[PDB]
């Protein structure tokens, strides 16, 4: 049932002294098929990832401690709590919600996170994975007798702790709801906790900045403010750092952590860089195969869990084979030609409004041949810039009208393709290539397969965003306009998408402007950068495209964050805003190491 495999990593595997009893009796080698690859030589005895039966005879008879078992993942049909529908994604057992502390979850996009959250909140009853005749709270509360779920599900059936939850998507709720500015917040739950969340989330402007005014980052901040003031006993937070300021991630973290104390269950799920270590106390890692089946592990501590998620990829019990050490592209290799045909498509320092936003410009020596990256806080107008360049306000008092053709990526995810996406893949065509730019980008998490034939309304935002990227670089254009492309993506597919678009357009010595709020893609896309300085609601100045180091220095010193690069995996981490390191880095200004 579990697929057992043998592995060989060892202190000096000795194919020069042992005489290789390792290969002289694997049962599969005897019958012709080669399981093991070694003779008298100098180095490691190779082994097939699949030709050992899991016999274990490979292990009993090496003289040195070279060989051992691992358990490759399989679909067991044991502890199936739910199936997304009949024949769909299979969900195994749930994490037991420890009270008094924040329970976090981590995993790749589309493995069973939001279904687990919807089940734990009583909004989805368990069906025990049956296609037909889903049970009704007598066989449930017998399927997990002798288990904590026996009592937990009754406490939510008599609503003695009636749950409350936050949504997955930011773009839905300001259309689905109705309420004028401030009065919705006042009439919802309270005034007291209303007052403390409002100030510590820095949304005190939304006494008069309306629900139609506010941006998707400001909407996540509203969604989190409203669920925090909502009076309930158990809480959940799906993606609570989707489109936020690099300081305001930690401010969200603190304002959720401020409700830990009074015997309240809380679960959070994130695609985190350095934020959840302050958010959660225990971790439960997920493994499986995307939108096919997903398994939940037993609890771990924060550092221990975050580590068994990427300091290798083995539980203390079993195995999985994904999420290895590449959270920084250590492959420092970049080469393309210099060309003296260069176009310097400069622009004036035009000053523009809408009702409230003074967002000044200074001129910049923008050129055709490479990408320019953009920095800045949320809500400072890094969006309106290239929205105005795309045929909107102030092209008249200066404003360089787009010289090359425009590919627009909008950040509000709402493609109007009812039916399936396949017909929206007709205002383009794929047939223009069948090539690495398309394959290595669109495929990695499974294949191109799930994103050809599907109604875009039931879509994981990740692959819809991969299609919006594909129809952006699939349109007749050359100036590509981008806005948080990394959102709604995991870590490794974020970097896949970043790397492959850099490489693809740099084949052509071609234009793009990128809007980021993250680090990794921003750091491996750049040789020049613009910065937004000043605080929102009054003023902002888009400084000219400077170098990388001094630019993001102006950035971080304005945000007052420094970073640390662990060499073993080149991992980034936040220094805690006051440290024996947060003094040298803040005296020398260095927040970027190992160029």
């Amino acid at each position: 049932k579990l697929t057992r495999i043998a592995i060989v990593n060892h202190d000096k595997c000795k194919p020069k002294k042992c005489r290789q009893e390792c290969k002289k009796s694997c049962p599969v080698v005897r019958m012709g098929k080669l399981c093991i690859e070694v003779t008298p030589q100098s180095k490691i005895a190779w082994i097939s990832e699949t030709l050992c039966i899991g016999c274990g005879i490979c292990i009993k008879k090496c003289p040195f401690g070279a060989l051992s078992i691992v358990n490759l993942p399989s679909n067991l049909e044991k502890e199936t709590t739910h199936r997304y529908c009949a024949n769909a994604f299979k969900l195994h057992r749930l994490p037991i919600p420890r009270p008094g502390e924040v329970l976090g979850l981590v995993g790749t996009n589309g493995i069973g996170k939001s279904t687990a959250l919807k089940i734990l909140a009583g909004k989805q009853k368990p069906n025990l994975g049956k296609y037909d005749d889903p049970p009704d709270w007598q066989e449930i509360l017998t399927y997990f007798r002798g288990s904590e779920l026996q009592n937990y599900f009754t406490k939510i059936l008599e609503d003695d702790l009636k749950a409350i939850i936050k949504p997955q998507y930011v773009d839905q709720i300001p259309k689905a709801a109705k309420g004028t500015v401030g009065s919705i917040l006042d009439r919802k739950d309270e005034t007291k906790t209303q007052a403390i969340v409002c100030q510590q989330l820095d949304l005190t402007h939304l006494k008069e900045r309306n629900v139609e005014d506010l941006s998707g980052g400001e909407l996540q901040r509203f969604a989190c403010a409203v669920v925090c003031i909502q009076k309930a006993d158990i809480f959940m937070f799906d993606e609570p750092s989707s489109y936020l300021d690099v300081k305001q991630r930690l401010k969200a973290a603190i304002t959720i952590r401020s409700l830990i104390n009074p015997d309240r269950y809380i679960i959070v799920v994130e695609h985190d860089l350095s934020v959840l270590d302050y958010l959660s106390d225990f971790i439960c890692c997920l493994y499986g195969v995307p939108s096919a089946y997903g398994v939940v592990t037993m609890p771990f501590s924060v550092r221990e869990g975050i580590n068994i998620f990427l300091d290798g990829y083995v539980p203390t019990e079993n195995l999985r084979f994904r999420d290895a050490s590449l959270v920084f592209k250590v492959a420092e290799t970049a080469n393309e030609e210099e060309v003296k045909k260069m176009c310097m498509y400069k622009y004036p320092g035009m000053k523009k409004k809408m009702g409230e936003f003074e967002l000044a410009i200074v001129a910049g020596e923008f050129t055709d041949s490479e990408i320019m990256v953009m920095l800045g806080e949320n809500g400072t107008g890094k969006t309106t810039f290239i929205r105005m360049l795309a045929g909107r306000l102030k092209p008249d008092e200066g404003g360089e009208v787009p010289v090359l053709n425009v590919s627009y990526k909008p950040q509000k995810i709402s493609p109007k393709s009812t039916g399936s996406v396949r017909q929206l893949l007709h205002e383009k065509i794929r047939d223009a290539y069948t090539h690495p730019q398309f394959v290595t980008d669109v495929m990695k998490p499974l294949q191109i397969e799930n994103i050809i034939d599907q109604e875009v309304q039931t879509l994981s935002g990740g692959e819809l965003q991969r299609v919006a990227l594909a129809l952006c670089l699939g349109k007749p254009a050359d100036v590509y306009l981008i806005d948080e492309p990394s959102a709604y993506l995991d870590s490794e597919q974020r970097l896949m998408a970043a790397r492959v678009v850099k490489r693809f357009i740099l084949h052509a010595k071609k234009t793009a402007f990128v809007v980021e709020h993250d680090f990794i893609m921003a750091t491996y896309l750049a040789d020049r950068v613009i910065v937004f300085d000043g605080i929102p609601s009054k003023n902002t100045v888009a400084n000219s495209p400077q170098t990388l180091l001094a630019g993001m220095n102006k950035f971080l010193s304005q945000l007052e964050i420094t970073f640390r690069r662990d060499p073993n995996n080149y991992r980034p981490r936040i220094n805690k805003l006051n440290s024996i390191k947060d003094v040298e880095q803040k005296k020398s200004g260095n927040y970027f190491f190992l160029d």
């Binding site: 049962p27 039966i53 005879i57």
Partner: protein, 70 residues
């Protein structure tokens, strides 16, 4: 070839046409024959017999009560 020892032994298959259920390189659970150390009957030097092929019986694989898990 046994799991724990690793040593090699020959075993009988106990009914008409069973040798088709036994694929190659799967597990099996061998048992004794019936005289505690000695070859039984007309067979020269075979001292063990199969009961389970892959967590399913032979008596059920052969009477039809179950089918191979694949």
């Amino acid at each position: 070839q046994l799991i724990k020892n690793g040593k090699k032994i020959t075993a009988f298959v106990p009914n008409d046409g069973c040798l088709n259920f036994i694929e190659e390189n799967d597990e099996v659970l061998v048992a004794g024959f019936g005289r505690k150390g000695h070859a039984v009957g007309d067979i020269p030097g075979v001292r063990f017999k199969v009961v389970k092929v892959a967590n399913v019986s032979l008596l059920a694989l052969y009477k039809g009560k179950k089918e191979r898990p694949r």
